Amino acid sequence: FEAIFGTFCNRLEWVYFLTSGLAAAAHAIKFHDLNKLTTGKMLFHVQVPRVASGAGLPTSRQTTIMVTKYSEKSPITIPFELSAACLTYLRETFEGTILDKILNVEAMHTVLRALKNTADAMERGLIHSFLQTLLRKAPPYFVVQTLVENATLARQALNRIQRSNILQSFKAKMLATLFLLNRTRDRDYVLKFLTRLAEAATDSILDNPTTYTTSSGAKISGVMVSTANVMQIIMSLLSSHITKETVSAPATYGNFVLSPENAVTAISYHSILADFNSYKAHLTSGQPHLPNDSLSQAGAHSLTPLSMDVIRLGEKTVIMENLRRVYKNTDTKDPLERNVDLT
Amino acid sequence: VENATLARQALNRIQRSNILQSFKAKMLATLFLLNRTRDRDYVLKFLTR
Amino acid sequence: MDARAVAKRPRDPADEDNELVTALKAKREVNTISVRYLYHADHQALTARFFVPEGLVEFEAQPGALLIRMETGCDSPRHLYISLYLLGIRASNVSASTRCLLESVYTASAARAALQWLDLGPHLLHRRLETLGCVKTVSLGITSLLTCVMRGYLYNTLKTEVFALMIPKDMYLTWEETRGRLQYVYLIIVYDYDGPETRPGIYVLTSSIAHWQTLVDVARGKFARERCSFVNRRITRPRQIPLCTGVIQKLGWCLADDIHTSFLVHKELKLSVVRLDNFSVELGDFREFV
Amino acid sequence: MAAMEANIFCTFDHKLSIADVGKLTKLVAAVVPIPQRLHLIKHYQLGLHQFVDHTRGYVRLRGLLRNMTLTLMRRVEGNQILLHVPTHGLLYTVLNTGPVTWEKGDALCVLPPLFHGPLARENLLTLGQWELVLPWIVPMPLALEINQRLLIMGLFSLDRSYEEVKAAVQQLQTITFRDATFTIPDPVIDQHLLIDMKTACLSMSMVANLASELTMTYVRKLALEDSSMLLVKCQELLMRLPARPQHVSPDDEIARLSALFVMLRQLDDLIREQVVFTVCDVSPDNKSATCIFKG
Amino acid sequence: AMEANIFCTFDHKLSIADVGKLTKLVAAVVPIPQRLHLIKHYQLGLHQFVDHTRGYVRLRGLLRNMTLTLMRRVEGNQILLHVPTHGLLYTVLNTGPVTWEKGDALCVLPPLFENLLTLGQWELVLPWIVPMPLALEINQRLLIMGLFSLDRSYEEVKAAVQQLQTITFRDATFTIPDPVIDQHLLIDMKTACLSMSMVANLASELTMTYVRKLALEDSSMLLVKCQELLMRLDRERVSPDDEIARLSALFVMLRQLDDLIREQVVFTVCDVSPDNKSATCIFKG
Amino acid sequence: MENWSALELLPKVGIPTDFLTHVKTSAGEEMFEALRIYYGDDPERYNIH
Amino acid sequence: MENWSALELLPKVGIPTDFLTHVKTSAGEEMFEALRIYYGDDPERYNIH
Amino acid sequence: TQNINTVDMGLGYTSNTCVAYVNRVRTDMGVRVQDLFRVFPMNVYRHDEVDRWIRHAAGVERPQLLDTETISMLTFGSMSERNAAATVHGQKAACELILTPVTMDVNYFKIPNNPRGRASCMLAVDPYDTEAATKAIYDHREADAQTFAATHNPWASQAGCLSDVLYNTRHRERLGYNSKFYSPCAQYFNTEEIIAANKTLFKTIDEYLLRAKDCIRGDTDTQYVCVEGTEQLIENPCRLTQEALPILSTTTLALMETKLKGGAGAFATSETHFGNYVVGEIIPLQQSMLFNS
Amino acid sequence: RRGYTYPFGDRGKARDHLAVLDRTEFDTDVRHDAEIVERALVSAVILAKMSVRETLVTAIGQTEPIAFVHLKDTEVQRIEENLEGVR
């Protein structure tokens, strides 16, 4: 005889956007009516201090700039398929025999398993798309370092010599740092490179002050991601500064909804101003400044803890995570494995 | 181990050539490991890997 | 079988649960997906998906147009999906201004290759082309996605609005002064054999006539000059084998009151078109008349 | 604004008797033509009687009927008749109006009625010098033979004298089909038929010119050493007056024969009617059948 | 929720391996002779129609009269066939030797060639699904090879027949069968070829009189050019009852050729898998 | 053109922030999608319709 | 140019209006500015954005 | 479908990317120069016997393509040469060869430089001044940047010279051009693209992130350009700098033997004999890449 | 023209020999005519032999000789005597 031992079905592992460290880089708000609109704009009003000039020299003027920020759309899709057998047996019975019961169980489990797999794939696609939009906008290291060294040296639109110097710094630092981990491993150099890379970015506009806090110590600021190999190298090298920690994260998406005064303006003038009643109250009360923005109001309330790695770059704390899990056995190439070419 | 993340598809010719380059490099590097070096950190890293 | 079951009213998809809802009800499980109501569930129109190069998409960025499949004998992509508006650049039934405008607008690289393939072969346009009905979405890029209906009422996903079909003004032809409330619309190709080239004309014809014999009778009546040209080339030049002074294809039924005249804008250039809003597609094959 | 109606109600306005509504009930599931489609129409527009004129040219009636729309009759009740327009491809039931026998597996066409026997059956709602004259549903061979004989008679009318034409017309007026026989009413030659004559003769001369040497010589060559009743009949029809073929060129020959194929199609379309019905199994009494509506 | 279906019972026993062989044809096309509800397996396919004297065009005519059906799941002791209705869409298996592209038009042809499962006095055979231009080309080539059947002795005819026999299409280069056997013609091919040649012959000597009579009146004036063309053809080279018989012969011979003149546009195709054997399409009358 | 007067008149949320480069350089070098810059005081905000 | 979708969707006050002429003539002869004369039921009022 | 909408709540750049760790090289780094007859398949010599002799001696088969219509299809784009039998090394790195005078100052190679002989970085020129940029990139009667001579390669710099008409993708279209081949120096001669690219600094780097990148097929031995979507684009610092890198090359085996014989750090130092020289790689790639391999 | 119209078992070789055949107008020089007619005649003979599907000498360098095909012995004798008289 021929013996068949135990048959195994794959124990597929689930993953979520919120449970991943990348969620700390993100603010997540859920909005059931998103399909209808295609425009999202924010506005910034800033007045720049002017130092009182000395005698004889040209004097400054009271000056302001007004700037707006716009929305990027990037919907994601996943198909899944059902055969005729499942579709016809899911809604039919034949004589009520045992084999028909087996077929019904198989069809129901097949369709529900397909739905579960599609939901997991949709979550993976959402985190993938967020990484896509984050990485497509991040500039490289040498340009941001050249910018951070030149902060004071321009106070106007760039003149010719200044941008020539910018280009010189570009070329020098590009030759200096086209690769990092393969060239030098003296821990001081790599740690100082990491802290420079962190300090280069400007901080976020809207803090969620009671999110992604360390369990007791302090508040987290940055999130950085790499493939498993680079993460292993860094963890081996920087072991003195590496710590384990439990952090608090929002357990669910934040809910944002239309108040009726928003709906009437939607119908009338094709526009909504968020947190409308707060605007009307603080306007008629004659007060200039609001406690919170609508986005921060939309933020979720409950907190749940989860474990992740964190290191110190000097008064700044940044999150470690390697995204190998989200593409462990999938199709698409992990976006963090980039190709760079030279001439 | 190193080439696990680059292709979960039908293994293409160029990836195969890279596999062979890694073969040629690492076979020469680790033929007589313990004879070659007794550096404690390196041998622990090799065993962990 | 029982009398009550036979007499019972027909099954009601109108309020009965969708299959996914039935399964999730059965196991008592909930996914994050808004599983209850399926989009396109009530759709009667048959939909196809087509990929097209970026050059041809112009004038399709506005929804509604005829999408035509043209042949090329090369090993590399054998078919190219072309729009009726671009096809007018070849027809001799287009005014000089409109042809110049279309020639200026479609000067993308891919379009001119299709124009070369159209006239680089011995065969006439009749054997080379085939119709795919009406196109109704855009997703731009280096390669763009089109979705198209081959047996349809022409509508947006939620059916929130009907989508019209636009025909360029120079091609539009009518053979009756009064219109019955129902009339069909056809695609018409005729050939001029007197010129050195087999010079083709492109026409779109609306008529209240559904029966083939009388429609062909009227067509031969109006196209008498072209028929005489065919006979003249046949007698004049032996060992040549011309055929089918004109061909007909049936493509549409529409309610005559719906017809309107409208302008169409793209690349801030302005085109003149005729418009049919409450349109539907019915597709037949090409057929020959002499 | 407008909507294309599919359910059509016809209302009478003559003070009908009981026998009229009785005969209406007999007509259930028959086919009737309408010139225009509305939700409620008057009886005067229903039926073919509105078109008849003293000239009574059969070709005129055929051409007029070709343009019309076809509908089926359902749920006959007092002075209100419901007509349902057919939808292409669906399965419908129909009761044949004329006496022509049907068979399963063939196709049917629409034609104006014919003179048959004593001309007894005109009882169809004769009221107020108006009557419900229904069109005929007949199988494909009979319709093709009718069109063939009308066109052939029209062609023969030319190049012939009056009495020769009269004899030929009196012969061609008859038809035989499936153990039945019928007579064509008023097949007078008219300008409508002259258009068909012109287009048919043009197509026939084109097929004559496009024919290649091999196609023409095939029949004469085969008569040399083959023999059968079909062959002897075909040879007897033709006029009476080995070698290597004069020219061989499959490319030019295939182009020529394709052009001749198109021309033969064009000549054939003159007699082919619109194929309205494809039939399924029929009740053995021949009265009613199940059919699919096409075209 | 059930739908309209046709039940078929295999009168011969089917082994498990044979059922597994047949199940690979989930959505292939199968013709049936008559629209019964419970059909016997002998009626399926085109095997009962094949004959040793009757030819290909007879099969084409019978297939035109045939009713087309689509297959459904095979199960215990019974197989289910779904008859299509116009303007819905269905899945078909490309049994033909020609690959398809989006927007192709298809028509059904009688077959010309693994093999399909057989029984003691039975084999199962299915028709071809082919794009329309290739169907025209193959019918034209097979008919023209029917014409050359008479002259086959000379070597020119053999070379020309060989050249006509090969057909080329998109990544397809198969060969069609020679319509002659033992230097003889199958009788249906003889009838079709003779009918075409006769309808060609009759028009050459019949049109002149009727054309020259109509020339006096045509305001469209191209009929006179037609007369001149016929006279140029003449330069290149009766009792009324005989005349009327000749006209009747012309039209009956033309009707005989109508078996091959028009094409049923059965299917139009929607996008196809790389499994290209399988494709989706919309059914047309 | 956006309704800048709405931005000026309506209440705001106070956020301390600093650009990487100098603010005037970021506006002058075209980094933002749309800009409105005025020197002194533009009375346009006081006119409403 | 007028937001007709707003007029359709928004609530409205009932009045017994009395046009001097037959109302279809007033629409036909452009007594008012900015008309809209859709026949049947026009579903365009639903596409809220 | 789950349509997500993102707003960038960052005034300045809030996120940075860097190339941390480098793996093995997909290209052979070799001198295995590419076939011009494949990229220009149209042209033939006038007298057919001369064409036969040249094609026989050169090692390239006479091109034949179905009918005339294939030439339009090829111009639209088609991969049209066979993969090699075996590949122990990776892709055949295409070398383009641009004619160059004998007298060229050899020091031009020893630094990161533009191979066209005329420095043309668009972060230097004034923004949106096409006239000034054209003057900088073509006008050889005004001093160049980075080397204040008029040019270091007369046959490669001028608008009408060899290396512009041959390499520039907009000019190349005037001749037989298979678009599928990624010409290495295409990005150094697309004067139209370079003139279009000279936007303001912030928008320049934004475009560099968005659209300046290109793609290369991973399935094939040779540098085929791909349709965007199947494989992600390639980051290119050289495109941003409009410069090129120098690689260790020597014109005699003795100096290469010294480079191999010498200890660590010998790769980055240049040296010259009477008529032979070494140009050292400016980045220590040959050591670092093999260090981890 | 006859080469264009005729079918063949291997069309490519026939097309190549027709291409070397179909443009042979004389270059108005006494010397050149003999060599060009020699080449054209070689092409014509090889095309005829391929049309008959007679064997043809494919050996390298050993080009097909100039000869008649399928002509009777009496006629070829007469033609050869006429050519001897021409000499």
Residue numbers in the entry:
A (entry chain I): 50 to 392
B (entry chain J): 197 to 245
C (entry chain W): 1 to 290
D (entry chain X): 1 to 241, 253 to 306
E (entry chain Y): 3 to 115, 122 to 245, 259 to 306
F (entry chain L), G (entry chain H): 1 to 49
H (entry chain I): 1078 to 1370
I (entry chain Z): 89 to 175
According to the publication:
Comparing subparticle reconstructions of VC1 and NC1 portal vertex, we observe analogous PVAT architecture characterized by three distinct layers of tegument protein that stack successively atop the portal complex and its integral DNA translocation channel. The resolution of our VC1 portal vertex reconstruction was sufficient to identify components of and build atomic models for most of the visible tegument structure, which revealed that the three tegument layers are each a pentamer of dimers. An innermost layer consisting of five sets of pUL77 dimers constitutes a portal cap directly above the portal complex. Above the portal cap lies two large tegument layers (LTLs), each consisting of five subunits of pUL48 (large tegument protein) dimerized with a subunit of pUL47 (inner tegument protein). In our VC1 structure (containing packaged viral DNA), the last-packaged genome terminus held within the portal’s DNA translocation channel contacts the underside of the upper pentamer layer. The end result is an inverted funnel lined with (positively-charged) arginine and lysine residues—namely, R234, K236, R237, and K576 from both pUL77-u and pUL77-l—that capture the genome terminus, presumably through interactions with dsDNA’s negatively charged backbone. Resolution of LTL was sufficient in our VC1 reconstruction to permit atomic modeling of pUL48 and pUL47 within LTL’s lower layer (LTL-lower). In their entirety, our LTL models show that pUL47/48-l and pUL47/48-u from the same asymmetric unit stack to form a tetramer, notably in a manner that exposes the tryptophan motif TQWPAM on pUL47/48-u dimer. We noticed tufts of filamentous density emanating from each pair of pUL47/48 dimers in VC1/NC1 PVAT.
